RNA sequence: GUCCCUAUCUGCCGUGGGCGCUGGAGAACUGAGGGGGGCUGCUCCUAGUACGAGAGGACCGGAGUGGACGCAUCACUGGUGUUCGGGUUGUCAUGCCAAUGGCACUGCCCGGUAGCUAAAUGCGGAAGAGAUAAGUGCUGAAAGCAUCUAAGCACGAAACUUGCCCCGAGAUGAGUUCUCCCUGACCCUUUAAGGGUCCUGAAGGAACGUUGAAGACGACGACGUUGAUAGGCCGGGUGUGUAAGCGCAGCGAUGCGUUGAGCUAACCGGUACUAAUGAACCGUGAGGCUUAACCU
RNA sequence: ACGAAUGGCGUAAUGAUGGCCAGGCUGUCUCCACCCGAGACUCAGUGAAAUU
RNA sequence: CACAGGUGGUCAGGUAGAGAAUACCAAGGCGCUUGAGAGAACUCGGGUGAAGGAACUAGGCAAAAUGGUGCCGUAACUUC
RNA sequence: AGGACCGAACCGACUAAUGUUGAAAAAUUAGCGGAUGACUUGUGGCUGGGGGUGAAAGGCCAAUCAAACCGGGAGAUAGCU
């Protein structure tokens, strides 16, 4: 089954009204390195909760 | 949980004899006709044992009048007055369901001689 | 747990050996007949010199089933085969003079005291 | 419905799952830290830690169970000679799962899983 | 009559001395504490609000804590209301326990049934004008909803261990909340 | 015309996001309204009674048990249970023996935990109330009577509204109750429900994490160290059925002992060992006008 | 009523040929239940179509 | 189309097997150019199934079942 | 010996399901038929459109066939849209 009428740009926008991405609420800051990171994720320099968990 | 266990613990029989599949047992069951209550004996081969505490059960198979009859007893039911092991069987399975295809010569069970 | 087309052995000496359930009596759209239930059958196999003859249509009461019967304590009795006892169409009384194999306490009703009396065992 | 059921299917059949976790347990034992997806790490806990517990008691039969599992004498030897005694006092929780972002190729949630005493 | 809030502990059996096995659902009905009494004057209807169980002191939100503190009761794991018949009255803070059922022969038990998720028509409805009428039986969410089962026989009220044994099955999984009311059909 | 349909629209079944509901928030409700449900057989007492020359046989009411259907559940009986145990064929591998693993539809099978589940087992249909239908009536004139009707009054069915169950305040007519939180300063101008800066950021929420008998995803629930939320661990249970190794018997297959052994998923009871991080984020700073009443 | 090389009547054997019956077997069904996979669903990347 | 298609000849290891079937392997070559999760309905391909056993249906369609070797034994009919 | 039997390669295509904006303008999967023959197959050759070829189906003759394809008559004709 297929449309009989071209849906409008209005309806396209209404359907896409729920497509918006949600930005990360806020980043965590490691107490030792001071790097920002996703909460519960290790930092880019391999820190987590003030611990060098992975070397390099 | 603990509550269910204590409730079951206040109902399990304490004098349950130990039997294994392949044993021949005689189960005395309470039978009530009218108002007269009496014991009927069911003797056969234990072919399955379900150990679930209060919900324990065991299946006994006998061939009465050329008909194979399986009766599953609820081990802790008061209707089961007594269980007596008449013969120790020597099998290797927990469930002897293959005995349903066995007749006469094929259904003998080796004695557990110890 | 007998339904239409089920083949049943006969537990009596009325002459029939195998019957097929042709209708489960006792209620509209009733599906299964257990131990103690009445069914119309047709005779499929009978002895040549018997009181009933192949193709006879008459009622019967189911006395043994593989599906089994449950007892109030949860226990269950199971048989190797499905067995019935022939009844007359109108009197609904047994036609044979003996019952072979055990029957159950579930027939202990005023309608079926004959079968309990004639039963070698009433489990 | 999957009420009370456990164990992730991981879009694999049973034999593939078993083989993959055998391999992954071997990698975790020999390297002591591996980078895998978060669900695989979580299921890997349930495969590796029982191996270590088994390795706690050193016997021929235990080594043959740890070999029937993991199918590797390198890994069995390391288990029973290093990880068993290293974790002899620790009651469970031999592994540590560290979430580490997302895989570039497919945006999978990645996680480091490592032995706790590494 | 009012009901009580309990917890579904699980199912078990009771063997009667004449050899009947009664499937029982064990309901742990611990003390229900009246947290609020509602009347016509202030509320337009008569009811009691009860709580039960215990709650994490650090997980009682401050509105909830104030509501329980007015009653002078300890925070429970929820609030439930029971409508009152005119002869019935209770006081805030008063505790109600399971021997309220000591003489009740049948009860109604309502709980949230197990959730079957998105269920098809076969499971959900036992399947085999220019429009569809409302209420058309279709696939959708099954279970996970309030369900009452009526006229369950009370097998045992054990006050000391806070137990109600009702004959038969009651809605919901083990550990779920149950509202047990004396049977309204009777 | 039939059947399909990668289903845009209508319809429908479910389930969310937004904003609203006039300070915000957490709950508990009310109930406008809507939906579901409403079936039936048999047996037994009344009662072999009334009736009928007999034969035959009630109305009414009462009591249990079935069917069909529905709702729930998994204690039982079972099914499933490619995540548990075992047997076994062919082959390959782990150096070899032994022991194991892979592959052959889960290789083929035998059992079976949890969960799910029916065939399993609990429960339901109602009672009651209100107003009625056909119909039965009371009184009563028109029409000196008669008349159930004109005034009035009483009954009257699974029909209607209730009563039972569920949804339900977006019921915009946006309701009620309880509780909780916020009690700074200043500037500007088209001076108003105005804008702005600084300080402040509550209750709570959200997010993240561990997850769930919740679940397509959202959602909903539990928990986040002051912790049993999940995994592991310990003990048990359960299942399977006497592991391996060793010893003995045997020529050997194999048997016996150690040994109801070893192993054992989702189960139970525990246990902080691992992971649930301090924070940060959103949400503000007493809540318009008019009029009535009351405290003063 | 067809009908005798537009062949009539038979015929062992043969047939992925038409019709029927029996045994066995069974989820074809009563009446579905559970499970294992591949999609469906969510996330990331790429990204059509009929129709209008 | 980097397309489940088509395309002649040659070579022919081991174990089991009658076999160039089939299973598992060698030599050798590959994991098929989207992944990651989840574990709804439903679709597709499978496994199992109580009691019944074709009651399904247009129709046993589909499925299930039979299946090997040796020895015995083997009907009507027959053009032998 | 055999247009013998069972059965792979090989040739086919009976059933069902899937697919049916396909993986595919005819397949896949599971079954199925033939499988020393009137078999099958490579290479090359020949037969040409009112013609060929056809164990014959109006089949096939380059995914096209109750008369191929291409160019021309040709802007055929169309009281029809
Ligand atoms: Mg159109
Ligand atoms: Mg979208
Ligand atoms: Mg779990
Ligand atoms: Mg995938
Ligand atoms: Mg395999
Ligand atoms: Mg669920
Ligand atoms: Mg049609
Ligand atoms: Mg569709
Ligand atoms: Mg209705
Ligand atoms: Mg259970
Ligand atoms: Mg079972
Ligand atoms: Mg199995
Ligand atoms: Mg196994
Ligand atoms: Mg060996
Ligand atoms: Mg291999
Ligand atoms: Mg292979
Ligand atoms: Mg009434
Ligand atoms: Mg008058
Ligand atoms: Mg009504
Ligand atoms: Mg834990
Ligand atoms: Mg055990
Ligand atoms: Mg072994
Ligand atoms: Mg001819
Ligand atoms: Mg059907
Ligand atoms: Mg996408
Ligand atoms: Mg386009
Ligand atoms: Mg490719
Ligand atoms: Mg190709
Ligand atoms: Mg070829
Ligand atoms: Mg091959
Ligand atoms: Mg699936
Ligand atoms: Mg399927
Ligand atoms: Mg099958
Ligand atoms: Mg079956
Ligand atoms: Mg069977
Ligand atoms: Mg049969
Ligand atoms: Mg038929
Ligand atoms: Mg037939
Ligand atoms: Mg039919
Ligand atoms: Mg077929
Ligand atoms: Mg098959
Ligand atoms: Mg031939
Ligand atoms: Mg051809
Ligand atoms: Mg299909
Ligand atoms: Mg094929
Ligand atoms: Mg042939
Ligand atoms: Mg052949
Ligand atoms: Mg033609
Ligand atoms: Mg062509
Ligand atoms: Mg022409
Ligand atoms: Mg011209
Ligand atoms: Mg032209």
Ramachandran region, residue D71 (left: φ > 0; alpha: ψ -120 to 50; beta: rest)? left
Rounded CA-CA distance C119/C56 in Å is 24
Nearest-angstrom CA–CA distance, E68 and E75: 6
B7 contacts on E by Cβ (under 8 Å): 12, 26, 163, 165
Residue where the block lists tokens 């709650």? E55
- Tokens representing residue B10 in the block: 């206040």
Nearest CA in chain B to C79: B69
Torsion (CA) E133, E135, E136, E138 in degrees, nearest 10? 150
Using CB atoms and an 8 Å cut-off, which of residues 2-31 of chain D contact chain E? Answer: 3
Cα separation of the two ends of chain D: 40
The answer to whether the CB of D80 falls within 8 A of the CB of D55 is yes
Residue among A42, A49, A55 with most chain D CBs within 10 A, to mutate = A42
The packing angle between helices D38-56 and D14-31, to 10°, is 70
- Tell whether the torsion through CA atoms of C23, C25, C29 and C34 is positive or negative: negative
As given in the structure block, the two tokens for residue D108 are 């999978």
Residue listed under structure tokens 């392949």:
B22
Output the CA C84–ligand 7 centroid distance in Å.
Answer: 45
Task: Find how far residue E142's CA is from the centre of its chain.
Answer: 20
The first and second tokens of residue E99, run together, are 């021997």
Q: What is the CATH number of the domain that holds D88?
A: 3.90.1030.10
E44 is in an annotated binding site: no
CA-wise closest residue to E92 among E180, E33, E169, E20: E33
Would D39 be classed as within a structural domain?
yes
For the record, the structure tokens of A26 come out as: 């806020």
Q: Rounded to 5 degrees, what are φ and ψ at B105?
A: -60, -30
φ, ψ of residue B57 in degrees (nearest 5):
-150, 160
The rounded distance, in Å, linking the Cα atoms of B5 and C64 is 37
Cα–Cα nearest to B69, from C32, C102, D106: C102
Interatomic CA distance for residues B86 and B111, integer angstroms: 11
* Phi, psi torsion values for E145, nearest 5 degrees: -140, 160
Domain count, chain E: 1
For chain E, the distance separating the N- and C-terminal CA atoms, rounded to the nearest angstrom, is 12
Give the relative orientation of helices D60-68 and D38-56 as an angle to the nearest 10 degrees. Answer: 160
3-state class (DSSP) for residue B17: coil
**Burial class of E85 by CB neighbour count within 10 A (0 to 12, 13 to 18, 19+):** exposed
Cβ(E2)–Cβ(E82) below 8 Å: yes
Beta-carbon separation of E19 and C74 below 8 A? no
Burial of residue D5 (number of CB atoms within 10 Å: 0-12, 13-18, 19+): exposed
Task: Tell me the helix, strand and coil percentages in chain C, rounded to 5.
Answer: 10, 40, 50
What tokens appear for A11 in the block? Answer: 């309806």
With contact defined as beta carbons under 8 Å apart, do B107 and B99 qualify?
Answer: yes
Torsion sign over Cα C36, C40, C42, C46: positive
Residue D99: its chain A contacts at CB < 8 A? Answer: 38, 40-42
> What DSSP assignment string belongs to chain E?
---EEEEEEEEEEEE-TTS-EEEEEEEE-PPEEEEEEE-HHHHSS-EEEEE-S---GGGS-HHHHHHHHHHT----S--EEEE--TT----TT-EE-GGGGTT-SEEEEEEEPPEEEEE-HHHHH-----SPPTT---SEEEESSEEEEEEEEEEEEETTTTEEEEES--SS-TT-EEEEEE-S--
Q: Are D63 and D80 in contact (CB under 8 A)?
A: yes
Query: Taking a C-beta distance cutoff of 8 angstroms, is the pair B78, B30 a contact?
Result: yes
How was this model experimentally determined?
A: cryo-EM
8 A C-beta contact, residue E34 and residue E49 = yes
- HSE of C7 in the Cβ direction (CA atoms, 13 Å)? 4
Which residues form the domain of E79? Answer: 1-186
Return the number of other C-beta atoms located less than 10 Å from residue D114's C-beta: 21
Question: How many CB atoms are closer than 10 A to CB C80?
Answer: 18
What gap in Å lies between CA C10 and CA C51, rounded to an integer?
13
* Euclidean distance between CA atoms B90 and B113, whole angstroms: 8
CA–CA distance, E24 with C10 (Å, rounded to integer): 40
Residues of E whose CB is below 8 A from B74: 21
**Could you say which DSSP state residue B11 is in?**
T
Q: Per the structure block, which two tokens stand in for D45?
A: 């806990």
Measured in whole angstroms, how far is the alpha carbon of residue B47 from the centre of its chain?
Answer: 8
Q: Answer yes or no: do B67 and C101 touch at CB < 8 A.
A: yes
Task: Yes or no: say if C107 and C117 are a contact pair by the CB < 8 Å rule.
Answer: no
A39 to chain D: closest CA residue: D99
* Bridge partners, E148 (sequence order): E110
What is the CATH number that goes with domain C1-123? Answer: 2.40.150.20
Residues with CB under 7 A from strand G: A 2-6, 21; C 3, 31; D 1-2, 5, 9, 11-14, 17, 106-107; E 122-123, 128
For E147-176, b/e burial (b = at least 16 CB within 10 A) is eebeebebbebbeeebbbbbbeebbbeeee
Q: Which nucleotides of H are covered by protein (CB under 7 A)?
A: 34-42, 50-55
Which one-letter DSSP state was computed for residue A7? P
Instruction: State how far Cα E124 lies from the chain centre.
Output: 24
φ, ψ of residue E93 to 5 degrees: the values are 90, -15
Using the beta-carbon criterion (under 8 Å), do D98 and A38 form an inter-chain contact? Answer: no
The DSSP annotation for A12-56 comes to HHHHGGG-PPPPPS--EE-TTT--EE-TTB--TTSEETTEE-S--
- Dihedral angle, C-alpha A7, A13, A18, A19, nearest 10 °: 100
Q: Other C-beta atoms within 10 Å of C32: how many?
A: 15
Taking Cα atoms as reference points, which of C63, C59, C37, C40 lies closest to residue C115? Answer: C63
DSSP summary character for residue B104:
G
Q: How far apart are CA E38 and CA E43, in angstroms?
A: 6
Say how far residue E145 (Cα) sits from the centre of its chain. 13
- Please give the resolution of this entry in Å, rounded to 1 decimal: 2.6
Q: Tokens in use for D35?
A: 């980078």
In whole angstroms, give the CA distance from residue A2 to residue E102. 66
Entry field: residues in chain D: 118
Contact present, C74 and B79 (Cβ < 8 Å)? no
The domains of chain B are located at 1-113
C-alpha distances out from residue E56 to E75, E77, E78, E81, E96, Å: 8, 9, 12, 22, 22
Alpha carbon separation from D86 to D32, D91, D97 (Å, rounded): 12, 12, 19
For residue C7, give Cα distances in angstroms to B66, C84, C95, E97, E177. Answer: 19, 10, 19, 57, 49
CA→C1' distance for C45 and G12 (Å) = 36
**Distance, CA of C26 to CA of C38 (rounded, Å):** 7
């Amino acid at each position: 089954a297929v449309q009989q009428n071209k849906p409008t740009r209005s309806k396209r926008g209404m359907r896409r009204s729920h497509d918006a991405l949600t930005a990360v609420t806020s980043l965590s800051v490691d107490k030792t390195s001071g790097e920002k990171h996703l909460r519960h994720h290790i930092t880019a320099d391999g820190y987590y909760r003030g611990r060098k968990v992975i070397a390099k | 949980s603990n509550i269910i266990k204590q409730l079951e613990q206040e109902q399990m029989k304490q004098d349950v004899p130990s039997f294994r599949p392949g044993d021949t047992v005689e189960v005395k069951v309470w039978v009530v006709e009218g108002s007269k209550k009496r014991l009927q004996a069911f003797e056969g081969v234990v072919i399955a044992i379900r150990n679930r505490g209060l919900h324990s059960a065991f299946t006994v198979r006998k061939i009465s009048n050329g008909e194979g009859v399986e009766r599953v007893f609820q081990t802790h039911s008061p209707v089961v007055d007594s269980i007596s092991v008449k013969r120790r069987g020597a099998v290797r399975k927990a469930k002897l369901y293959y005995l349903r295809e066995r007749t006469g010569k094929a259904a003998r069970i080796k004695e557990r001689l110890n | 747990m007998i339904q239409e087309q089920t083949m049943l052995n006969v537990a009596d000496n009325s002459g029939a050996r195998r019957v097929m359930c042709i209708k489960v009596l006792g209620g509209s759209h009733r599906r299964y007949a257990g131990v103690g239930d009445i069914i119309k059958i047709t005779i499929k196999e009978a002895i040549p010199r018997g009181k009933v003859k192949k193709g006879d249509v008459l009622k019967a009461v189911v006395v043994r089933t593989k599906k089994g019967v449950r007892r109030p304590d949860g226990s269950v009795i199971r048989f190797d085969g499905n067995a019935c006892v022939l009844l007359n169409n109108n009197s609904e009384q047994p036609i044979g003079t003996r019952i072979f194999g055990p029957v159950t306490r579930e027939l202990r009703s005023e309608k079926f005291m004959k079968i309990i009396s004639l039963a070698p065992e009433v489990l | 419905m999957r009420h009370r059921k456990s164990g992730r299917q991981l879009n694999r059949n049973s034999s593939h799952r078993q083989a993959m976790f055998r391999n992954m347990a071997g990698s975790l034992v020999r390297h002591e830290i591996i980078k895998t997806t978060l669900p695989k790490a979580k299921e890997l806990r349930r495969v590796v830690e029982p191996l270590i517990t088994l390795a706690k008691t050193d016997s021929v039969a235990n080594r043959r169970l740890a070999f029937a599992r993991t199918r590797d004498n390198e890994i069995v030897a390391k288990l029973f000679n290093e990880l068993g005694p290293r974790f002899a006092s620790r009651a469970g929780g031999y592994t540590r799962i560290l979430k580490c972002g997302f895989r570039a190729g497919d945006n999978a949630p990645m996680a480091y899983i490592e032995l706790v005493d590494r | 009559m009012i009901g009580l809030v309990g917890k579904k502990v699980g199912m078990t059996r009771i063997f009667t001395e004449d050899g009947v096995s009664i499937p029982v659902t064990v309901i742990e009905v611990e003390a229900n504490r009246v947290t609020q009494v509602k009347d016509l004057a202030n509320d337009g209807y008569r009811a009691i609000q009860v709580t039960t169980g215990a709650k994490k002191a650090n997980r009682v939100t401050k509105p909830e804590a104030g509501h329980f503190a007015k009653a002078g009761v300890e925070a429970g794991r929820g609030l439930w209301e029971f409508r009152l018949a005119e002869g019935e009255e209770f006081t805030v803070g008063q505790s109600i326990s399971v021997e309220l059922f000591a003489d009740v022969k049948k009860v109604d038990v309502t709980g949230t049934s197990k959730g079957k998720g998105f269920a098809g028509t076969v499971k959900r409805w036992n399947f085999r004008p220019g429009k569809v009428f409302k209420g058309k039986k279709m696939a959708g969410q099954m279970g996970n909803e309030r369900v009452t089962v009526q006229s369950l026989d009370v097998v045992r009220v054990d006050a000391e261990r806070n137990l109600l044994l009702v004959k038969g099955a009651v809605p919901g999984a083990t550990g779920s909340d149950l509202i047990v009311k004396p049977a309204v059909k009777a």
